Design a protein around this ligand. Structure first.
Ligand SMILES: C[C@H]1O[C@H](O[C@H]2[C@H](O)[C@@H](O)[C@@H](O[C@H]3[C@H](O)[C@@H](O)[C@@H](O)O[C@@H]3CO)O[C@@H]2CO)[C@H](O)[C@@H](O)[C@@H]1N[C@H]1C=C(CO)[C@@H](O)[C@H](O)[C@H]1O
Ligand SMILES: [Ca+2]
Length: 636
């Protein structure tokens, strides 16, 4: 009967911090071939979204590509879709930042010759109040998933039309991405998509199905270049989709200029379905997966999927404390820097979402993406006057201590081993502790043997000046892996503190539990210096007992595929050119240095691999009753 309207869109994005070859590959593998083929089919209509950095990379490297986009826009083949310039997850940044973020990209769209009216929701993380924000930015529609609607209570059958939604008395139009099309396109043969769309036709001329997904899926994703281009999937699809009398191709704006949204509906906090898995704590994510698989295993996932639920994106801040700290620190800086445009631009760049979470691969686990966020938090803050302060930054209920001078910002957590969790260099714009601890993930456990022997999961978070207590006969390999016997209770327990001039005095009354609790007291005087910091230690035991006290210092060493190593040293240097640079650790007394890379499990189609998140340096000093020494970190 009536034709079925079809909306085709792509979303192109490269997170800040990506290697140059990555942009080049995505452009050659996807961005360019895709538009060249679109140019060949005058009747094809595409709704495309480009992230700000991407458009900036293109203007600098591939200017001609922009002339092609202007042309296609001019011939009615492209509707430019926007969002937050630097791909922030809108719901996770200040409302003020949402405005400027979107307008920066609206300005760019405008320069391609198109007044953007729609927004691609980054990671489709929805919150009711985004309505107000999108509305203030002049946006008339946002792109979400069918799953957001199913979660609200509607059945898939009533999701082939866009809907209105309101908040604060403001209303905006919402289009749902048909999950099926995300799997049919472009991975399955063309006929599979044509058959599906044709079966959707009804007596309702306004019915519409929506496809909108990653542009990189058409060429970059493993295997897609061969399938989409070498084997002609795109050319065959564009020909089929434009030569079908039951399928009416149109852009989002064209649809709204002809059909009114079906009605009013309210959406919960959600994202696309797959995200319901990743955003759950590892244990629960595993259960979620078992549940989904067992439903499919009993051929009943299809009729019951509308009731399946999982986590929400913001909970990555719970799953990864390092992401939460990163996030809250940028929120802190965004506020203090809001009236300074030059400074503010840096904080807006720090809101690029990728490094804040982890799906099946990458994200927060890629040091280069993480350092880029930190790099920007630091550059924005550098415009502010240094000022020490006590406050609960990551909201765990126990204040942090921020000590800072003209060249550094150190964040101490008295509650957790009185350690330094953040040592940011204002000169290098690097956080020396921009590392991650080794954690189990629901998708772990197949993994090869060569890697299993190097796998280990931490019980300790990782910071700087982490006080240990091990047996003289303890081995590096036992320590490296988490097998060793930690005699003390100072690594993850609270420390008393006293503020001083340019630093803090920390001390803890604990004990060295071996054969009997032997009460101990660790003291550390941390003071910021112009090129780092210095810590004067004074360990004390209540009763004699041969042992080894160790001060651990984790470092965001990224470009140094370091390996386990133990050596004798009073002072040693570290040279990490592409990461934290050059630094020196000086002791006033020699010690046994234990070094090892922090390895994290990374899954790819090329099997399992390892990502070095940083390196741990532990300076061991023997102790029986009294121990006194000084450690100095120096930035070169
Ligand atoms: C992370 C990604 O999730 C969503 O993507 C899903 C695709 O739409 C699905 O079709 C499916 O793709 C798999 C193929 O079916 C399969 O045959 C094989 O080729 O592997 C594909 C990938 O596993 O599953 C995808 C989820 O795994 C979503 O639509 C997409 O926008 C999301 N991409 C964002 C995430 C990151 C990571 O930080 C960014 O690099 C992207 O630019 C974002 O758009
Ligand atoms: Ca806290």
């Amino acid at each position: 009967m009536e034709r079925i309207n079809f909306i085709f869109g792509i979303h192109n994005h490269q997170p800040l911090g990506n290697f140059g070859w990555v942009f080049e590959e995505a452009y050659n593998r996807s961005y360019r071939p895709f538009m060249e083929i679109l140019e060949e089919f005058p009747e094809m209509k595409v709704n495309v979204h480009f992230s700000g950095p991407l458009l900036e990379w293109i203007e600098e490297n591939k200017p001609d590509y922009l002339d092609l986009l202007r042309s296609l826009i001019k011939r009615g083949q492209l509707e430019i879709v926007v969002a937050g310039f630097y791909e922030p997850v809108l719901a996770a940044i200040p409302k003020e930042d949402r405005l400027v973020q979107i307008e920066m990209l609206k300005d760019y769209a405008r320069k391609l010759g198109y007044d953007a009216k729609g927004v691609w929701l980054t990671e489709r993380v929805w919150q009711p109040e985004l309505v107000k924000s999108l509305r203030e930015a002049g946006i008339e529609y946002v792109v979400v998933d069918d799953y957001h609607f199913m979660s609200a209570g509607l059945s898939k059958e009533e999701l082939f039309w866009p809907y209105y939604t309101e908040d604060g008395g403001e209303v905006i139009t919402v289009f749902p991405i048909d999950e099926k099309l995300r799997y049919l396109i472009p991975f399955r043969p063309v006929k599979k998509t044509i058959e599906y769309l044709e079966s959707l036709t009804s007596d309702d001329p306004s019915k519409v199905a929506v496809f909108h997904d990653d542009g990189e899926k058409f060429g970059v994703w493993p295997g897609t270049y061969e399938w989409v281009y070498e084997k002609g999937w795109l050319r065959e699809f564009f020909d089929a989709i434009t030569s079908n009398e039951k399928i009416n191709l149109m852009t989002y704006s064209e649809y709204l200029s002809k059909f009114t949204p079906r009605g009013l509906v309210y959406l919960p906090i959600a994202s696309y379905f797959e995200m319901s898995e990743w955003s759950l704590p590892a244990k629960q994510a595993k259960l979620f997966v078992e549940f989904v698989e067992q439903l499919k295993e009993e051929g009943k996932f299809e009729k019951y999927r509308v009731f399946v639920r999982g986590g929400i994106w913001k909970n990555f801040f719970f799953k990864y404390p390092e992401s939460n700290f990163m996030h809250k620190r940028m929120l802190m800086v965004s506020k203090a820097v809001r009236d300074n445009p030059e400074a503010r631009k840096y904080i807006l760049k720090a809101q690029c979402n990728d490094a804040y979470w982890h799906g099946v691969f990458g994200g927060i686990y890629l040091p280069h993406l993480r350092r880029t966020v930190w790099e920007n938090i630091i550059k924005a803050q550098r415009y502010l006057k240094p000022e020490n302060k006590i406050l609960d930054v990551d909201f765990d209920g126990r204040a942090e201590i921020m000590v800072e001078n003209d060249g550094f910002i150190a964040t101490i957590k008295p509650h957790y081993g009185g350690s330094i969790f953040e040592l940011s260099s204002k000169r290098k714009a690097v956080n020396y502790n921009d590392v991650l601890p080794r954690r189990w993930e629901h998708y772990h456990e197949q993994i090869p043997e060569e890697i299993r022997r190097e796998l280990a999961y931490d019980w300790q978070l990782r910071a700087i000046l982490q006080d240990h207590f091990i047996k003289p006969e303890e081995t590096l390999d036992n320590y490296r892996l988490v097998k060793y016997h930690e005699l003390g209770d100072f690594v993850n327990q609270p420390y008393e503190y006293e503020m001083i001039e340019n630093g803090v005095k920390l001390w803890r009354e604990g004990g060295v539990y071996a054969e009997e609790k032997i009460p101990a007291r660790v003291e550390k005087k941390i003071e910021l210096t112009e090129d780092g910091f210095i810590a004067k230690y004074r360990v004390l035991l209540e009763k004699p007992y041969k042992a080894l006290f160790g001060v651990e210092i984790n470092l965001a060493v990224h470009s140094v595929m370091e390996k386990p190593e133990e050596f004798e040293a009073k002072e040693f240097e570290v040279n990490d050119p592409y990461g934290i640079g050059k630094v020196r650790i000086e002791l006033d007394k020699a010690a046994k240095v234990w070094k090892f890379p922090i390895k994290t499990l990374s899954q790819s189609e090329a099997g399992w691999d390892f990502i070095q998140q940083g390196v741990s340096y532990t300076m061991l000093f023997p102790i029986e009753k009294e121990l006194e020494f000084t450690v100095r970190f120096r930035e070169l």
